[PDB]
Design a protein around this ligand. Structure first.
Ligand SMILES: Nc1ccn([C@H]2CC[C@@H](COP(=O)(O)OP(=O)(O)OP(=O)(O)O)O2)c(=O)n1
Ligand SMILES: [Mg+2]
Ligand SMILES: [Mg+2]
Ligand SMILES: [Mg+2]
Ligand SMILES: [Mg+2]
Ligand SMILES: [Mg+2]
Length: 539
DNA sequence: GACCACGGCGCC
DNA sequence: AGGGCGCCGTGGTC
């Protein structure tokens, strides 16, 4: 390319180099642009950022985030990564995408700009005639990138003092548990080491080993194994409690307070748009899609996610979302009839599990029923079902049998989906998002069957993901107009922040947008709460 | 200081 | 031998 002075003309493709992967934390080391057979390198990258009207190119959203951090409105546009990800969601990295579609991902901005341009040309060619994938690009993924950039740059407020205090408290309880474990083992060892614990439990204390690990075939110490040994030796209960607390402390209580950004005073995640096989988003650095919620100890951590002063959080969660999608995709008249009748499958299963009326089911019980319902749907074994329900193996089988006999069109939809996957090499969502699943004709049964479970899950999880994305795209402009913010997405949930004076209206509107995004054969239902913190906003 | 593989486990 | 993720500490290694 011809070297030309900065700035580039409008419409140019950008290349950029960051000091680290997180745009909210990165130094912008270099910036360049390419168009029309020319490359333009910025003498000073931060100054030069002001000259761009759009971020067009590889990882455009990341540059947009850094621009927003600096007070600039630089929306992301075309990004070859999104085209590639739609063609095949195994396309998750710029290294891999460049090699597959025509170049090399280097560490120089001018080269990255030129690469972006040529990758765009080639990948745009590949999507010609792929009308459904093009619709996803234009109506979902490209506009969504701008939404994600605003979410990332906005961040969420954290009660740091509350978590710092919690660390001190949890440490004392951890020490009580470890001391007891070491007393019972008769010696000290590294309780965080699963290899050392294995030896202590199964060789020294002579407890029965129940299961093996996946890759290395050691005797497992996982919670399901420990649960089955709780009455076999008092050490087991202590270990379970120790793991609960150390998990909370090491993963959430200690790390999160140290990640407050010095300028925003908030915590900033990354919402990765080309990271999953199904079309879901993921969140990283830190992951805010797995903040604890199940146990009362984990719940305390959610209290730390708070609204700005004078604002409230608004939490919206699609009800029974994948079950509704399955009713639409399969066309099962009976499953559709459940949602037309306003019933709740999770509550119904919980009533059975715990042996109480529907009205006696509490939130803890209902949540427990979710793993069972989704587990069974996507191929859980009778053995495992019998294990985490503490019931005979026989009535676990029968429960699985009763499940599929109630909704006949589901088995048929599974069989069609799998034959299509074998024939075409991919399965697809309602909107035509694809996942290639090559091991569907593997001759090793366990491998083949695992591939089948991946394959028929994807249209369901992926259609739910497509719906949530479309809802975000539609909702975002409306929030902006009301002076509200979108903070987090957690797969089938959104967390917004609204001024107190507007929070009730924002909740009503966001519910409506989410319910009406793309009607199915069954209504979509959304539960919405408002509160000072994330725990209170979901109650 | 890092990379990776693993087991383990937090959420959806 | 439920599906999708990312992060922990350990262990091995460079
Ligand atoms: N153990 C789980 C939990 C969740 N999911 C997937 C399927 C539903 C989706 C969203 O999770 P939830 O909101 O917790 O499930 P829900 O059915 O929408 O329940 P709720 O009515 O409480 O929102 O995630 C899953 O595959 N396995
Ligand atoms: Mg407040
Ligand atoms: Mg839900
Ligand atoms: Mg949810
Ligand atoms: Mg390091
Ligand atoms: Mg490596």
């Amino acid at each position: 390319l011809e070297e030309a002075p900065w700035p580039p003309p409008e419409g140019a493709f950008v290349g950029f180099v960051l000091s680290r992967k997180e745009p909210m934390w990165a130094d912008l080391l270099a910036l360049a642009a390419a168009r029309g057979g020319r490359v333009h390198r910025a003498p000073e990258p931060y100054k030069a950022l002001r000259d761009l009207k759009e971020a067009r190119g590889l990882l455009a959203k990341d540059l947009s985030v850094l621009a927003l951090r600096e007070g600039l409105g630089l929306p992301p546009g075309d990004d070859p990564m999104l085209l590639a990800y739609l063609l095949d969601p195994s396309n998750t990295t710029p290294e891999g995408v460049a090699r597959r579609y025509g170049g090399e991902w280097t560490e120089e901005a001018g080269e990255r700009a030129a690469l972006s341009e040529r990758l765009f040309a080639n990948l745009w060619g590949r999507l010609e005639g792929e009308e459904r994938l093009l619709w996803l690009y234009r109506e979902v993924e490209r506009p969504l990138s701008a939404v994600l950039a605003h979410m990332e740059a906005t961040g969420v407020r954290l009660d740091v003092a509350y978590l710092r205090a919690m660390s001190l408290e949890v440490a004392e309880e951890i020490a009580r548990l470890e001391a007891e474990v070491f007393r019972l083992a008769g010696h000290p060892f590294n309780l965080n080491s699963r290899d050392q614990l294995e030896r202590v439990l199964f060789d020294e204390l002579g407890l029965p080993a129940i299961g093996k690990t996946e890759k290395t075939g050691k005797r497992s110490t996982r919670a399901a194994v420990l649960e089955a040994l709780r009455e076999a030796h008092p050490i087991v209960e202590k270990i379970l409690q120790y793991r609960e607390l150390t998990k909370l402390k090491s993963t959430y209580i200690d790390p999160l307070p140290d990640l407050i950004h010095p300028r925003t005073g908030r915590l900033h995640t990354r919402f990765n748009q080309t990271a999953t096989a199904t079309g879901r988003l993921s969140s990283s650095d830190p992951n805010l899609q797995n903040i604890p919620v199940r146990t009362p100890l984990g719940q305390r951590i959610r209290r730390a996610f708070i609204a700005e002063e004078g604002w409230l959080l608004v939490a919206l969660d699609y009800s029974q979302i994948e079950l509704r999608v399955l009713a639409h995709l399969s066309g099962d008249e009976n499953l559709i009839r459940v949602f037309q009748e306003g019933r709740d499958f999770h509550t119904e299963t919980a009533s059975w599990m715990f042996g109480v009326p529907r009205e006696a089911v509490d939130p803890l019980m209902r949540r427990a029923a979710k793993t069972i319902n989704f587990g069974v749907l996507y191929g859980m074994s009778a053995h495992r079902l019998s294990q985490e329900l503490a019931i005979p193996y026989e009535e676990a089988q029968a429960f699985i049998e009763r499940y599929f006999q109630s909704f006949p069109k589901v088995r048929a939809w599974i069989e069609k989906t799998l034959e299509e996957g074998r024939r075409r090499g991919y399965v697809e969502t309602l909107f035509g998002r694809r996942r290639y699943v090559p091991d569907l004709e593997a001759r090793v049964k366990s491998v083949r069957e695992a591939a089948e479970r991946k394959a028929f899950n994807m249209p369901v999880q992926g259609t739910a993901a497509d719906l949530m994305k479309l809802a975000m795209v539609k909702l975002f402009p409306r929030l902006e107009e009301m002076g509200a913010r979108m903070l987090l997405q957690v797969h089938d949930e959104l967390v917004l922040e609204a001024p107190k004076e507007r929070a009730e209206a924002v909740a009503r509107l966001a519910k409506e947008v989410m319910e009406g995004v793309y009607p199915l054969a069954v209504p979509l239902e959304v539960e919405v709460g408002i509160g000072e913190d994330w725990l209170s906003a979901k109650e």
